[PDB]
Each structure stands twice: as structure tokens, then as C-alpha cells.
Design an enzyme around this catalytic site. Structure first.
Site, short mmCIF file in Angstrom:
data_model
loop_
_atom_site.label_atom_id
_atom_site.label_comp_id
_atom_site.label_asym_id
_atom_site.label_seq_id
_atom_site.Cartn_x
_atom_site.Cartn_y
_atom_site.Cartn_z
CG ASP A 77 -2.25 0.76 1.19
OD1 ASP A 77 -1.92 1.90 0.52
OD2 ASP A 77 -3.37 0.42 1.51
CG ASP A 168 -2.65 3.47 -3.25
OD1 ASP A 168 -3.80 3.16 -3.89
OD2 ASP A 168 -2.48 3.52 -2.27
CD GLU A 169 -5.27 -0.48 -1.08
OE1 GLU A 169 -5.94 -1.71 -1.00
OE2 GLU A 169 -5.91 0.55 -0.59
#
Ligand SMILES: Nc1ccn([C@H]2CC[C@@H](COP(=O)(O)OP(=O)(O)OP(=O)(O)O)O2)c(=O)n1
Ligand SMILES: [Mg+2]
Ligand SMILES: [Mg+2]
Ligand SMILES: [Mg+2]
Length: 431
Positions: A77, A168-169
DNA sequence: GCGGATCAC
DNA sequence: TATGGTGATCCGC
């Protein structure tokens, strides 16, 4: 600001708005739904509880024997991603509270701003009251997509079939990589600082290497979680955020110990409503979720209490499914109020064209066309039509959507549809 | 197959 | 002044 004052400022800002009226209506529905459930918990008899208990314990032992702890799952993350990019590229935003978005809606905030209660999905004009020194910078989604490409290139070294959940994950299955890495020379796991450093052979070390490379390549920090399944990896991904890692060691006792007082709300799938309902039964942590399993197997549907049981036992997916095909494709849009019908037909035709172009890029055709209407009171309706043959062009799609919309405009005649949002969705893609 | 609800990101 | 967009799933019809 503090959790008591924030709720107050928010309450003052939202009060009397149509948005807030709709929220009250929604909360009344949730409340009633709970009352009904309670009426059900009242009429449950000890006999039925006992029988249910044995049923659930049977299925539970079935789960527990199949507990897989051999895989190593990571959840990566990026910390405050959008805002962190914006901070990376504008020094003036150093040590300042910032959020990314518009005055109508904020996408994300940095930790500084989060300390004032401003957060994702909050309108800018409210966050400003929470923090008038807040800097709202406009989104640059292309930048984010590009940086995201940089970190995906890195994650692909550890699991080529990693599963990106957003920009972003992501989820990684590094089991295989760990296996190869255990007999790697120091050379394959040496990297330069932007004059060198080496990473060990363990899971923690693999993730320290990943986070290191990411920070070198992008100047941005990532947090991560390590565990035998996706559920646990996702939860302890949050544990040492930002710029931190946490591992749950792959022994049953570690899993159980970590689970013991974990609020079920942290788990992926437990949203606000489920949290409130479970709270109504005195269930807040995962162990209370385990202790109430029989009652739950009587208050909730099979899928739901099977899922709750998986949570209570610290189980979860241990393999990442390679991304299947999309089941739908949609486009929708909020605007200042539109009530003239001809304008509404224009917006519908526009959405349909946009959708058709998007279908064109993936060369897809579907059989179901659904429109979405949100009136000025934030009430949302949906209207679908399924058609014998697949459709793809703007004209076909608009042919269906037009009639659905017409039906809705007629149903209120002689009153105009006062809508703040319209959308068109296509699904039922070919097998 | 439809529509409302819920959830993730 | 002003409260998002995309995709998925589930349940009760
Ligand atoms: N209701 C929401 C919440 C989030 N997002 C998107 C915007 C950014 C991305 C990740 O945002 P968060 O996970 O909310 O926070 P973050 O900025 O990633 O920070 P952190 O994860 O470190 O708290 O998800 C969204 O579209 N809609
Ligand atoms: Mg995130
Ligand atoms: Mg994040
Ligand atoms: Mg959750």
C-alpha cells in the site's frame, strides 16, 4: 482538532442539506432493518441455538482441518499516494496539510491533514472548515498512473501474477519467490542507494527490499503486510502504516493471537452497515464473532455466516486469482441540476457515446443496458433492459437507454425529473 | 433477469 | 455554491 470537535463541525456543515436528509432516511432504514433482526433474535429458542451450534461447529472443524499456512501473501500500500506524489513534486507543500481534489470532493489527504479529520471522499468545502489552512491541489491522475507503473514493474519481480487492487494497492504471492531466493547469491539481492546494500532471505527481508526499491525509484514510501492469507495480509498491512511492515508468522497460534481483539470493521467486506448490525448483537471483535457463530447462522444467510466464520477463524484466500473478465462497464456523471427533458436526452446520448468508445477500446459487446438516475435529493434509481442480441454502438445503446429514461420521465409526468446525476452501464458480456 | 443495498478503492 | 466514479456482489423478489 479532536474526534469530538470534528463530528460537531461536520454536523454544522451538513445540517439541513438535501444530502443530509437522504442520509437520515438511509439511517432510518438501517435502524429498522436492525429492529427486525432483533425481533428475530427474540424468537430464537435454546433448542434451535443448540442445534445450530453443532451445525456450525461441524462446518468449522471442516474449515480448521483445511487451514493452509504454507503460502506467503503480501499486501503493498503506497502511503497517502496521490498526496505524496503532489508533495514529491512541489517542495512548497512541505510540512503542510494538503488534500488532492476539488472543493466538491477530495480524493485523499496527507497525514498532516488527516490529523484535522479531513479524509478521502469528503467534500472540500467541509474539510476547509475542519482546516482552513488546508491546501487543495487538483488531481493529476496521469502522473499517479505513471508512478503506479513504476511500482508495478518492481512488484512483478516477486510475483508476475500479483493482483493490483488500485493504483497504489496490490496483493503478492511471494511463496515461489521465497523458494528461489533461499539459495540466491548476495549478488542477486544487492541494490544501490540513490554505495550498496543487501537484503536477506526471509519474508520480512523480501518486503524490506521491495519497499526499498520503491522508495529509490519513486521517492515514495510504501507500507506492507505479511501473512498466510489475503485477509490477514490486508489487515496487518495497516498495522505499521506509514512506511512500515508487519508480519503475522505462519503458525496457527500467531494467527489466533492477532485475531483475538481485531475489530471486525478492519476486515475487508465489513462496511459501516454490517458493523452497526453486528454491534447490535454485541459483536465488535473477531472473537465475539466466533462466540456468536450459531446465532449468526440463524440471523444471517449462508454466504454471510460462512464468511463471518472464515473471519473469526483467521482464514482467507491463499491464492490470487488471475484477473477474470470484467462483468460490466459503465460511465456516469454528476452535474448542476438538469430538469428539462430534452437536455436529459442529450446527456443520456452523450453518456452512451462515451460508453461505446470505451467498449470499442476493449472490443466488447453486451446484452444489458442499465441507466442510473440520482435526483436532487440524492435518491438513486436504476433501470435495466436485457436484449436478445449483443449491442455495442452509441446508437444501439442509446436506443435502449432512451426508452428506459422515457419511462422514468413519464412516471412522474407532468413533473420534471430533477436529476443531479445520470449514468449508463452495459453488462451481460458473451461467454 | 431486476432493483435496491452494500462494499472496496 | 458546493457531498464522486467504477466495478462487484448479494438478496429478495
Ligand atoms: N471513498 C474512496 C476512498 C478512496 N478512494 C481512492 C483514492 C485514493 C485511493 C487510496 O486512498 P485511501 O486508501 O483512502 O488512503 P491513502 O491516500 O492511500 O492513504 P493510506 O492508505 O496511507 O491511509 O483510493 C476512492 O476513490 N474513494
Ligand atoms: Mg489504499
Ligand atoms: Mg494507500
Ligand atoms: Mg472493512
Amino acid at each position: 482538532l479532536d474526534k469530538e470537535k470534528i463530528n460537531k463541525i461536520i454536523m454544522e456543515a451538513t445540517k439541513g442539506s438535501r444530502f443530509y436528509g437522504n442520509e437520515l432516511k438511509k439511517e432510518k432504514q438501517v435502524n429498522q432493518r436492525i429492529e427486525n433482526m432483533m425481533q428475530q433474535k427474540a424468537q430464537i429458542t435454546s433448542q434451535q441455538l443448540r442445534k445450530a451450534q453443532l451445525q456450525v461447529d461441524r462446518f468449522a472443524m471442516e474449515l480448521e482441518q483445511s487451514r493452509n499456512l504454507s503460502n506467503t501473501i503480501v499486501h503493498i500500500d503506497m502511503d497517502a499516494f496521490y498526496a505524496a506524489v503532489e508533495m514529491r513534486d512541489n517542495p512548497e507543500l512541505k510540512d503542510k496539510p494538503i488534500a488532492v481534489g476539488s472543493m466538491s470532493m477530495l480524493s485523499t489527504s496527507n497525514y498532516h491533514a488527516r490529523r484535522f479529520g479531513v479524509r478521502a471522499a469528503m467534500p472540500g468545502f467541509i474539510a476547509k472548515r475542519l482546516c482552513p489552512q488546508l491546501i487543495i491541489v487538483p488531481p493529476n491522475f496521469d502522473k499517479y498512473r505513471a508512478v503506479s507503473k513504476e511500482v508495478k514493474e518492481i512488484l512483478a519481480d516477486y510475483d508476475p501474477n500479483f493482483m493490483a487492487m488500485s493504483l497504489d494497492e496490490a496483493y503478492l504471492n511471494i511463496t515461489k519467490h521465497l523458494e528461489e531466493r533461499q539459495n540466491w547469491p548476495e549478488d542477486k539481492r544487492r541494490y544501490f542507494i540513490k554505495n550498496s546494500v543487501v537484503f536477506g532471505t526471509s519474508a520480512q527481508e523480501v518486503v524490506k527490499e521491495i519497499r526499498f526499491r520503491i522508495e529509490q525509484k519513486t521517492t515514495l514510501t510504501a507500507s506492507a503486510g505479511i501473512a498466510p492469507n489475503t485477509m490477514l495480509a490486508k489487515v496487518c498491512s495497516d498495522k505499521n502504516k506509514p512506511n512500515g511492515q508487519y508480519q503475522i508468522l505462519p503458525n496457527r497460534q500467531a494467527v489466533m493471537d492477532f485475531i483475538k481483539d481485531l475489530p471486525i470493521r478492519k476486515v475487508s467486506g465489513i462496511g459501516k452497515v454490517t458493523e452497526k448490525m453486528l454491534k447490535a448483537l454485541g459483536i465488535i471483535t473477531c472473537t465475539e464473532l466466533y462466540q456468536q457463530r450459531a446465532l449468526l447462522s440463524l440471523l444471517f444467510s449462508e454466504t454471510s455466516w460462512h464468511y463471518f466464520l472464515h473471519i473469526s477463524l483467521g482464514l482467507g484466500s491463499t491464492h490470487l486469482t488471475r484477473d477474470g473478465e470484467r462483468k460490466s462497464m459503465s460511465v456516469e456523471r454528476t452535474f448542476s441540476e438538469i430538469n428539462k427533458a430534452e437536455e436529459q436526452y442529450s446527456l443520456c446520448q452523450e453518456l452512451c457515446s462515451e460508453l461505446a468508445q470505451d467498449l470499442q477500446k476493449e472490443r466488447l459487446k453486451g446484452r444489458t443496458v442499465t441507466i442510473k438516475l440520482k435526483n436532487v435529493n440524492f435518491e438513486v434509481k436504476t433501470r435495466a433492459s436485457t436484449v436478445s442480441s449483443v449491442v455495442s454502438t452509441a446508437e444501439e445503446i442509446f436506443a435502449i437507454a432512451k426508452e428506459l429514461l422515457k419511462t422514468e420521465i413519464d412516471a412522474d409526468f407532468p413533473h420534471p425529473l430533477r436529476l443531479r446525476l445520470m449514468g449508463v452501464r452495459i453488462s451481460s458480456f458473451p461467454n
